Structure 1
Amino acid sequence: EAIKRGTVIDHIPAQIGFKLLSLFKLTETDQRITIGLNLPSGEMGRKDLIKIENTFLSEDQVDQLALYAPQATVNRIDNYEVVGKSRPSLPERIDNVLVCPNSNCISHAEPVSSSFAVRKRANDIALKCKYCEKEFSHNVVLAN
């Protein structure tokens, strides 16, 4: 169910919508939000869907979605019309939302934002910690 002005994130995989809502604190706002989870989609099986009024995502904000919903589409909406359309591209760095798998990483106990360099690989994505300089499969970083 649509809106007048704002952003619509379409084609999010099942079980990722709520994850996105959590990681990116998207509901910490006063704006009207409309969410669909486990909606039917012949397009891809089944999908989650997020709609936020009067709110817009910079290219990089969109890019931050890439690790979780690579094939999502981000539509801009004004006067009920789709005005813009983009897709998430792998970013160079991912800040703030991952946590280092290294139990000894200085980044745990201290007042700094996590940060990783992002590097495309054959069968996974490599994440390198700004701080401890160790590199991990996104599978490891992302699974808990």
Structure 2
Amino acid sequence: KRGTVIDHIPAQIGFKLLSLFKLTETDQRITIGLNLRKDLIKIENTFLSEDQVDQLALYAPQATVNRIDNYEVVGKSRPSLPERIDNVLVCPNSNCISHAEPVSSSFAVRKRANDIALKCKYCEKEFSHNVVLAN
């Protein structure tokens, strides 16, 4: 197909990537292979935007995304950590207005020595990505 493909996904991150980013809410054919151990997802007639690939950085850091306009590669890339992460993350501060309210989550992103810092748009608290990501 003439679309986009994601190679070298850490095992058990394939199903999550399909889930968190609503990749199965399209009409195209999707090929998915879990545990080769490397997960991989592929979508026909689907091209990913610039920052759209960036958002995978936190979950599949060392992973490759290849573009297909022919039966061969038209452009290969790796995800780079973005300035902001919207929609998919949940704020650990339980007093955050974000919860129960009809707004999308948003965190500023900031690399550190050991952790990645995620500062909430709303409650303005900064957390280590390990705390934010623990569901």
Decide: shared fold, TM above 0.5.
yes
Distance 1:59 1:9 in 2: 14
Instruction: Give CA deviations for 1:52-110 in whole Å, capped at 9, x if unaligned.
Output: 00001111001000000011111001221100111100000000000000111000121
Instruction: Give CA deviations for 1:26-74 in whole Å, capped at 9, x if unaligned.
Output: 00011000001011xxxxxx21000000001111001000000011111
Aligned residues: 135
Which structure has more helix as a fraction of its residues? Answer: 2
2:114 counterpart of 1:117: no
Distance 1:121 1:51 in 2: 32
SS class of match (2:58)? coil
Distance 1:92 1:142 in 2: 17
Distance 1:114 1:60 in 2: 17
Q: Provide the residue aligned with 1:70 in structure 2.
A: 61
When the two chains are superposed, the root-mean-square deviation of aligned CA atoms in Å is 0.6
Q: Cα offset for 1:124? A: 1.0
Distance 2:45 2:129 in 1: 32
The answer for unaligned runs of 5 or more in structure 2 is: none
Q: Which moved more, 1:77-86 or 1:30-39?
A: 77-86
Distance 1:38 1:143 in 2: 23
The answer for unaligned runs of 5 or more in structure 1 is: 40-45
Percent of aligned pairs with the same residue? 100
Q: Cα offset for 1:140? A: 0.8
SS class of match (2:53)? helix
Give the TM-score normalised by the residue count of structure 1: 0.92
Distance 1:49 1:99 in 2: 26
